[PDB]
């Protein structure tokens, strides 16, 4: 839930192509190549390799053995892949312990882990932004459809841990609920932040209706 650096990382295959291995003494090496290019992969002594001299490995495929780091798989196979990975890898633990919960739930949360994106081609606020993805669906939507001059707002999918996801959100109210209140407010203040009461958390502090 907090996409982090696992214990025994498995070097994923950034390239989709064919495999090639080698025997000198200290470190193994798995080569992935297409008629286009090849990429070297350092696989130290302890990495038991799952792949063989011979066939194809989709992008983000397990090359080493074991755990994978979400960011890498994201960068390689996409968001669609990280989500699907997060979900199943979680259910993995619950199933093995008898618990039988519906995937819907884990999805709902995972989704919030990727409800944020970065800005590399601006329009309104400068570029290393990192803001809510639909809020950009908003800008790009009216910037190309109702007011013109297509100012493509080019963004990058961004992956953040469940903690971080919430430690940095829309309403300041919600962020002051954490032990960072001192910072959360400073920023919120300076900028003239109208907290539109969207969530429940924020909306309860006020004693307002859910």
């Amino acid at each position: 839930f907090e996409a982090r650096r696992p214990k025994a990382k498995a070097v994923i295959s950034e390239i989709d192509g064919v495999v090639r291995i080698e025997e000198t003494e200290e470190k193994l090496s798995v080569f992935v190549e297409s008629e286009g290019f090849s990429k070297e992969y350092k696989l130290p002594k302890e990495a038991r390799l799952l792949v063989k001299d011979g066939d194809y490995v989709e992008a983000g495929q397990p090359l080493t053995r074991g755990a994978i780091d979400p960011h890498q798989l994201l960068e390689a196979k996409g968001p669609e892949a990280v989500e699907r990975y997060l979900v199943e890898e979680i259910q993995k633990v619950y199933r093995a312990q008898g618990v039988k919960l519906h995937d819907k739930h884990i999805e709902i949360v995972v989704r919030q882990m990727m409800k944020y994106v970065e800005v590399t081609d601006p329009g309104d606020s400068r570029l290393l932004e990192g803001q809510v993805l639909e809020k950009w669906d908003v800008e790009a939507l009216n910037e190309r459809l109702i007011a013109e001059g297509k100012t493509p707002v080019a963004w990058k999918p961004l992956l953040m841990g469940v903690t971080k996801s919430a430690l940095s959100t829309k309403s300041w109210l919600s962020a002051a609920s954490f032990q960072n209140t001192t910072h959360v407010l400073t920023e919120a203040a300076i900028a003239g932040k109208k907290d539109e009461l969207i969530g429940l958390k924020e909306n309860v502090i006020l004693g307002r209706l859910i």
Partner: protein, 1119 residues
């Protein structure tokens, strides 16, 4: 009743005094009963010698020497009962002889100075601090010595550690990190271990070749030669390395401290620290800790040896030097005495600090008494330890066992120098050495686990707190009745064996029989078996050994059993279990429940209040019996005389019974016939159905005593009178308040009645305009005073039994300031077994009473006798304790056999022996049946059929013979008292010992409608009478948030707890018949906003269009 018992491993030695730990510690501690001549000088006298020669010389005019002759305490201010009736802390005086010297003529000896009113110890082992008996709990920690522990992160080599307690004493570490440096740290930063040895004298050549030729690391030692070429100068150089910017010339000044007196010192010369050093590393230490002040040139037999073992620990195999910290010889247990001596010495330092200043202040010579001693420090210091020290708490005297177990309990949570809360995973586990030393099981269930633990039965803290346990010797194939109380460390050295080993006497009987080397189970031969285990009893605690067939219970659940007993509430009808382990007797005797006869004689008088026995020596003593006194926890403590008029007593025989003993035997419950089947779900998960027949007999009834109190306070509005005048409405309510004011003894007080009356003044400063008119209309003159009288709290009262009133002109009491006068009222009530109460057997079956059934219809036996309690079976498979099912069976036999048995822990009754007694029971149950005139039922035969189709009875055999088979199995045919028809299939029944557990203050069914409110935070608060509000936590918040409960969540925040204006209009609204007012803003919010405004920031709510909106309604706009 007859007593049959089993298992025979010859219990070679009696248990020890169960309170030896507390008792002896406070004995050696304050060596009072013996003259200063007597030689035990540790503790008080020691802490006294330690800080008394105050050698102060010069910084103007000194040469001071205030000595110490002899410490002699003596005549207690008041006594024990007077100490609990009045609120005084029972403490013995203490004024030692003193004499200050002079550099001019004279040495004024102003003899006594009483400083220090130090608590005494009850004969059982507890204390009497303010009004509540208190107990000092022992502790555990690294025993001051030296160890070498693996290094932090670099998988490479391990370092050293020299451990000096007191805290104001250095903490050294030897670590070599070779591209160019070595690290020795007293306080924090390093320097060469060489610079230090050089100072003492160890020159490079001598050092390198004699200490480390075998050890290469020497190169790191001889490395910075420039400084190693100059000696005493190395002494000043190190001084230089420490830092202020100090004088390069204090002669033998600070090296002294790591040298001789206060910082290093493990308490006593010989065995406190040296044993640790000598058994673990290096060989000697002349001077307790590393210490000398004879020639100005220091001697350190400790500093080099620690490095010696590091150069050694870093190589091959001297021995193998790695210390499992948790070995009991390494984590030392702090007995009470040490805990009071430390606080006594801290205080001594505080005293001597201030005295030093008065050596300059007194003009010239009249300085002895007051000019050097002020008792303020000693008082605040010791008093603080007995009353506020985290290490001390309310004596848990729910019942005798609880007090006994609480007294002998160990905990690491302590001082600060010793272990805190981020720690625990390796301390909390049950280390190997924990054997006969600490029960595996006795620890708490939850957050505290492994941290607080109680020592095993035979375990004793010998000379310096290393838990030793019993072990008898076995020379060759011969086992002895001689016993060695062994330290946890020396036990590694030998091949020890378990009690359970066929023994012909001195002969071991089987070739391959088990022994357990240090920590690993091992099949040894009779010829290696050096030592054996005294008995199973030594492996666990006293609180656990009381469980019947412990062997058959999951250690996880036997824990619940042991803590269950500590919750045992004394029942008017005491009763020892139908089956006991063997410590019940010893528990009441060693705890101080029953009253025993000193020496043999005859009885003179037997009162409900006193037994004046006549010893044959020509003397007679009156033995009062604490009639109905109030335990710190409410349970009753009464000694009911068991001896008749004119009876020749056997020295050591019960004259009276303790709170819960039957006849000298512990009794925390009552034997009750029980059927173990399912009812109409009344005993659902863990619920128990009870037979009304149990209440008819005063069986599970327990006498409890609650104590309500009220004060006449002095307000500037006017004194609060305590008169029979309760202003506003009736005489009926006054009745029981009979004595003008206080409530009349023997009066039944129900919730709400006036227990004591009080009259305080109405407003804060001013009278009332509206209330002025009203009073005038019907009767202007009225008593303009408030009715603040101590009423009975919701929950319950009983019948007043005793009252206290400390009015003006006090006798020898301490009434607090403002306190005009106090009024205590003791109320007692018979708590009968009722639904909601919780009873549990010694195996962990802990359930709550769900239904009290009319004897009319619960399960009844073939012959009229009904069962008292019906236990659900489903609470036995999951949990693993077949032992309760083993007890019920043996119990069934005891009922028809009319006898009680004793089944030891690992060596006791066996399934075949049980089946044997049942066999004898069949004749009493069915034999009388045969003679009395009648045979078997339609029912009895019917259940047999379904039973043979079941597989419990060999088909073909006759019902007579069939039922015997079936009975031996532990079950008999029961008929449903409601229908009269059988319960298809045999059901087991029997005598099971079930206890009732104490009601904490939480059971008082809380329920709160409207009431007080906090001063600052505006949320619901209770206290005396109006129940406090329940908390609505985030976890609960999410519950509602999850559901669509929008208003329900809004109200929890607004109309119920914080909306000031809200709850107001809320009540009134509810009173007149309409929906509640919609929520006004939370005080939390408003409080938050201002909190936020106090800080430069500005929090303003906004509108639809960003525009104002107003939360603070009208009070912030201005003027």
């Amino acid at each position: 009743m007859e007593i049959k018992r089993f298992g025979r491993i010859r219990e070679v030695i009696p248990l020890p005094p169960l309170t030896e730990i507390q008792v002896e510690s406070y004995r050696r501690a304050l060596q009072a009963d013996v003259p200063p001549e007597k030689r035990e000088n540790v503790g008080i006298q020691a802490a006294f010698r330690e800080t008394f020669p105050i050698e102060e010389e010069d910084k103007g005019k000194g040469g001071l020497v205030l000595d110490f002759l002899e410490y002699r305490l003596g005549e207690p201010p008041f006594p024990q009962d007077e100490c609990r009736e009045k609120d005084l802390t029972y403490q013995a005086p203490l004024y030692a002889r003193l004499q200050l010297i002079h550099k001019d003529t004279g040495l004024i000896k102003e003899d006594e100075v009483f400083l220090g009113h130090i608590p005494l110890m009850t004969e059982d082992g507890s204390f009497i601090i303010n009004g509540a008996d208190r107990v000092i709990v022992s502790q555990i920690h690294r025993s001051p010595g030296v160890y070498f522990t693996p290094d932090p992160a670099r998988p490479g080599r391990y370092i050293a550690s020299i451990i000096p307690l007191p805290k104001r004493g250095p903490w050294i570490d030897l670590e070599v990190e070779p591209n160019g440096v070595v690290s020795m740290k007293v306080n924090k930063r390093k320097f060469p271990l060489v610079l230090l040895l050089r100072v003492l004298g160890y020159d490079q050549e001598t050092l390198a070749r004699e200490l480390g030729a075998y050890g290469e690391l020497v190169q790191g030692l001889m490395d910075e030669s420039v400084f190693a070429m100059r000696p005493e100068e190395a002494l000043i150089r190190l001084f230089t390395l420490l830092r202020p910017g100090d004088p390069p010339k204090r002669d033998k000044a600070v090296a002294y401290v790591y040298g001789l007196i206060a910082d290093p010192r493990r308490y006593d010369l010989g065995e406190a620290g040296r044993y640790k050093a000598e058994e673990k590393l290096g060989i000697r230490l002349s001077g307790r800790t590393l210490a000398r002040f004879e020639d100005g040139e220091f001697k350190d037999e400790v500093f080099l040896p620690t490095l010696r073992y590091l150069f050694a620990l870093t190589a091959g195999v001297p021995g193998h030097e790695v210390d499992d910290i948790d070995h009991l010889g390494n984590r030392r247990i702090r007995t009470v005495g040490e805990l009071m001596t430390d606080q006594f010495r801290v205080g001594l330092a505080r005293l001597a600090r201030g005295v030093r200043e008065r050596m300059l202040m007194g003009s010239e010579d009249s300085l002895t008494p007051a000019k050097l001693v002020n008792s303020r420090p000693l008082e605040a210091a010791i008093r603080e330890f007995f009353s506020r020290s985290q290490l001390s708490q309310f004596k848990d005297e729910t019942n005798p066992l609880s007090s006994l177990r609480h007294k002998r309990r160990i905990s690491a949570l302590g001082p600060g120098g010793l272990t805190r809360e981020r720690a625990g995973f390796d301390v909390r586990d049950v280390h190997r050495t924990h054997y006969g030393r600490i029960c595996p099981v006795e620890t708490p269930e939850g957050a505290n686990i492994g941290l607080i633990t109680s020592l095993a039965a035979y375990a004793r803290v010998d000379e310096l707190g290393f838990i030793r346990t019993p072990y008898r010797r076995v020379v060759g194939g011969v086992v002895t009745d001689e016993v060695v109380y062994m330290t946890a460390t020396e036990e590694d050295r030998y091949t020890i064996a378990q009690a359970n080993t066929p023994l012909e006497g001195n002969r071991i009987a089987a070739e391959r029989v088990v022994a357990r080397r240090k920590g690993e189970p091992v099949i040894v031969s009779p010829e290696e078996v050096e030592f054996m285990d005294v008995s199973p009893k030594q492996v666990f605690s006293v609180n656990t050994n009381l469980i019947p067939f412990l062997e058959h219970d999951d250690a996880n659940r036997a824990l619940m059993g042991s803590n269950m007993q500590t919750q045992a509430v004394p029942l008017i009808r005491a009763q020892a279990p139908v089956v006991m382990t063997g410590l019940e007797e010893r528990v009441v005797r060693d705890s101080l429940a029953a009253l025993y006869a000193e020496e043999d004689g005859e009885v003179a008088k037997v009162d409900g209040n006193r037994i004046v026995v006549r010893y044959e020596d020509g003397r007679l003593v009156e033995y009062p019996l604490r009639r109905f006194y109030r335990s710190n926890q409410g349970t009753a403590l009464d000694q009911r005389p068991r001896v008749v008029v004119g009876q020749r007593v056997r020295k050591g025989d019960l004259l009276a019974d303790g709170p819960a003993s039957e006849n000298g035997f512990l009794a925390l419950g009552q034997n009750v016939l029980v059927a173990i089947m399912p009812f109409d779900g009344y005993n659902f998960e863990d619920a128990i159905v009870i037979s009304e027949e149990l209440l008819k007999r005063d069986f599970y009834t327990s006498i409890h005593i609650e104590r309500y109190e009220i004060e006449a306070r002095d307000t500037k509005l006017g004194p609060e009178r305590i008169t029979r005048d309760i202003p506003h409405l009736s005489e009926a309510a006054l009745r029981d308040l009979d004595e003008e004011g206080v409530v009349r003894i023997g009066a039944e007080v129900k919730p709400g009645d006036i227990l004591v009356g009080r009259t305080s003044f109405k407003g804060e400063s001013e009278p009332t305009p509206e209330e002025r008119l009203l009073r005038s209309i019907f009767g202007e003159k009225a008593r303009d005073v408030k009715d603040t009288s101590l009423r009975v709290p919701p929950g319950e009262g009983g019948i007043v039994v005793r009252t206290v009133r400390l009015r003006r002109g006090d006798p020898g009491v301490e009434l607090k300031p403002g306190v005009r006068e106090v009024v205590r009222v003791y109320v007692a009530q018979k708590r009968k077994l009722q639904v909601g109460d919780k009873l549990a057997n010694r195996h962990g079956n802990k359930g709550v009473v769900a239904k009290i059934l009319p004897v009319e219809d619960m399960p009844h036996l073939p012959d009229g006798t009904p069962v008292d309690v019906i236990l659900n079976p489903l609470g036995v498979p999951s949990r693993m304790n077949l032992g309760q099912i083993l007890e019920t069976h043996l119990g069934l036999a005891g009922y028809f056999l009319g006898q009680r048995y004793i089944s030891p822990i690992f060596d006791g009754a066996k399934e075949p022996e049980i089946k044997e007694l049942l066999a004898q029971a069949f004749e009493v149950y069915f034999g009388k049946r045969k003679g009395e005139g009648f045979g078997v039922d339609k029912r009895e035969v019917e259940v047999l059929r379904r039973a043979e189709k079941l597989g419990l009875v060999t088909p073909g055999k006759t019902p007579e013979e069939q039922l015997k088979e079936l009975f031996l199995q532990g079950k008999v045919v029961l008929y449903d008292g409601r229908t009269g028809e059988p319960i298809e299939g045999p059901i087991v029944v029997g005598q099971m010992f079930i206890m009732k557990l104490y009601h904490m203050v939480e059971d008082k069914m809380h329920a709160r409608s409207t009431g007080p409110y906090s001063l600052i935070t505006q949320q619901p608060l209770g206290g005396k009478a109006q129940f406090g509000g329940q908390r609505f936590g985030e976890m609960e918040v999410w519950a509602l948030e999850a559901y669509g409960a929008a208003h329900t969540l809004q109200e929890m925040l607004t109309l119920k707890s914080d909306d000031i204006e809200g709850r107001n209009a809320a009540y009134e609204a509810i009173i007149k018949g309409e929906d509640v007012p919609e929520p006004s803003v939370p005080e939390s919010f408003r409080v938050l906003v201002k909190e936020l405004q106090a800080l430069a920031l500005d929090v303003q709510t906004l509108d639809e269009k960003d525009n104002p909106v107003d939360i603070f309604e009208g009070l912030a706009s201005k003027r």
